[PDB]
Amino acid sequence: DVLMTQTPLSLPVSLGDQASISCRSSQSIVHSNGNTYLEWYLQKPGQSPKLLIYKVSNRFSGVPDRFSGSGSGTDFTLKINRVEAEDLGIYYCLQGSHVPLTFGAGTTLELKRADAAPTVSIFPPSSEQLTSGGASVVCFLNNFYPKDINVKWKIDGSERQNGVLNSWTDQDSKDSTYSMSSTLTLTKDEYERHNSYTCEATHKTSTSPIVKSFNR
Amino acid sequence: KVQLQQSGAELVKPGASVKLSCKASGYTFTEYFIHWVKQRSGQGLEWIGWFYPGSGSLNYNGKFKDKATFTADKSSSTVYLELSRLTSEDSAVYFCASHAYDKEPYWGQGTLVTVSAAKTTPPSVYPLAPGSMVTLGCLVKGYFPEPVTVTWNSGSLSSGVHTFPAVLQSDLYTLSSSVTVPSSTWPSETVTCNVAHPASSTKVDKKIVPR
Numbered sequence: 001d002v003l004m005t006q007t008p009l010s011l012p013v014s015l016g017d018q019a020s021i022s023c024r025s026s027q028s029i030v031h032s033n034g035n036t037y038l039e040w041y042l043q044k045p046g047q048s049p050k051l052l053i054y055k056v057s058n059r060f061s062g063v064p065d066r067f068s069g070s071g072s073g074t075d076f077t078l079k080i081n082r083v084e085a086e087d088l089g090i091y092y093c094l095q096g097s098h099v100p101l102t103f104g105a106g107t108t109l110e111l112k113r114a115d116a117a118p119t120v121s122i123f124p125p126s127s128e129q130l131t132s133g134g135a136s137v138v139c140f141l142n143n144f145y146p147k148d149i150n151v152k153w154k155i156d157g158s159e160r161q162n163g164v165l166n167s168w169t170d171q172d173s174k175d176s177t178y179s180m181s182s183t184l185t186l187t188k189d190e191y192e193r194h195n196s197y198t199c200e201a202t203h204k205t206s207t208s209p210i211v212k213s214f215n216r
Numbered sequence: 217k218v219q220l221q222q223s224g225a226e227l228v229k230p231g232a233s234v235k236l237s238c239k240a241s242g243y244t245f246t247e248y249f250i251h252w253v254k255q256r257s258g259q260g261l262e263w264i265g266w267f268y269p270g271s272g273s274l275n276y277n278g279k280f281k282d283k284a285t286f287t288a289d290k291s292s293s294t295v296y297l298e299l300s301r302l303t304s305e306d307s308a309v310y311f312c313a314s315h316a317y318d319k320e321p322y323w324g325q326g327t328l329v330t331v332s333a334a335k336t337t338p339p340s341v342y343p344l345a346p347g348s349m350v351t352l353g354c355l356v357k358g359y360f361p362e363p364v365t366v367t368w369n370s371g372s373l374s375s376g377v378h379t380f381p382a383v384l385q386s387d388l389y390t391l392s393s394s395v396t397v398p399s400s401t402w403p404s405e406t407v408t409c410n411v412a413h414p415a416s417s418t419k420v421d422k423k424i425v426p427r
């Protein structure tokens with residue numbers, strides 16, 4: 001299959017900036033009929049992808065003229081002349097010349113802001129949950145930037161990997177940060193046979209993790 | 217105007233099949249291609265195949281050959297995608313797209329498919345209290361299906377709130393919501409999370425009290 005390689009994976013911009021996104025195909029995507037079927041889409045969370053550009057350089061009806069596409073053969077580029085807030089989201093290229101049709105992995109356009117370390121908070125299981133025979137330990141890693149982050153759980157100083165579920169917010173509309181929740185769920189029985197619970201947040205703002213813990 | 221109307225969200229039992237529909241208007245039905253596209257939560261787009269209802273011609277992505285079946289009802293300008301023997305990997309949004317040969321495509325709004333054996337179940341709501349600002353939360357666990365609506369203090373507390381996307385575990389959803397307030401306001405003032413679940417027609421409150 002034709003591989004579509006999009007770069008960059010992530011592009012932080014300020015409103016008003018110029019933006020340029022690249023899409024390279026692993027082989028020529030000139031169709032046998034002479035045309036090149038290369039399309040660009042923008043997708044926001046919870047919405048369908050919206051067509052911006054088709055056949056390399058043609059703007060779909062209703063698309064603002066700040067969007068433009070160009071390219072030839074295996075080398076394609078989408079440009080935004082002065083980014084607006086509604087332009088933030090994930091951009092995909094799609095080749096329609098060779099079956100199976102294939103998409104690039106996406107380029108996220110996000111708002112640039114100052115780097116920020118996460119605010120980390122740990123919570124023991126509620127007495128209500130324990131009465132039900134369950135035990136979830138919750139860690140909030142809040143208002144950090146950039147979005148890349150790792151969380152590690154420790155029980156009695158030992159790394160725990162099973163029973164951990166994570167969830168991430170979209171970029172905040174007010175302060176442009178990201179947040180993450182991590183939940184470690186045990187049986188009540190197992191929870192009461194250990195003492196110390198720890199979640200460690202590793203983010204680019206520091207080589208040392210942010211460590212939050214509590215003791216039963 | 218070219219329009220594609222996709223069928224409503226589906227809750228599918230594991231192992232069962234489901235048939236999604238895409239009803240077209242605003243053009244000569246038999247003269248446009250229909251494509252189907254899959255998108256798993258937080259992932260990219262994946263092409264399933266194309267179908268030309270005007271001839272019955274089709275092509276599947278080999279990755280979907282044993283999973284997807286395209287059919288049409290010309291008499292109602294409707295195309296169908298049947299997905300067989302569903303697994304967790306089949307939980308996704310499915311989009312249909314239509315175009316004339318060498319012309320721009322028009323996309324439907326997508327149909328959500330969720331695979332679970334669960335019946336309608338209201339959430340259990342648990343307080344998250346700590347052991348100049350303080351962060352509190354509530355854990356909303358074991359509900360089905362989506363969505364729930366979480367507020368704090370009946371909506372009056374909206375700044376500094378993070379409600380996280382739910383995750384499906386053991387066929388049920390779990391999510392958490394955090395709120396950050398000045399330490400001067402809790403526990404000296406009341407902070408309560410409210411959780412509404414339309415499918416079960418329930419709404420419950422949980423006051424956050426210090427342990």
Ligand SMILES: CCCCC[C@H](O)/C=C/[C@H]1[C@H](O)CC(=O)[C@@H]1CCCCCCC(=O)O
Pocket residue numbers: 031037039095096097101249251252253263266313315316317318319320321
């Ligand atoms: C999600 C996909 C949307 C459609 C993408 C693109 O716009 C479609 C391109 C078509 C083009 O219009 C004609 C063509 O050959 C491309 C591939 C799909 C039709 C294939 C039918 C006949 C054949 O197999 O050559």
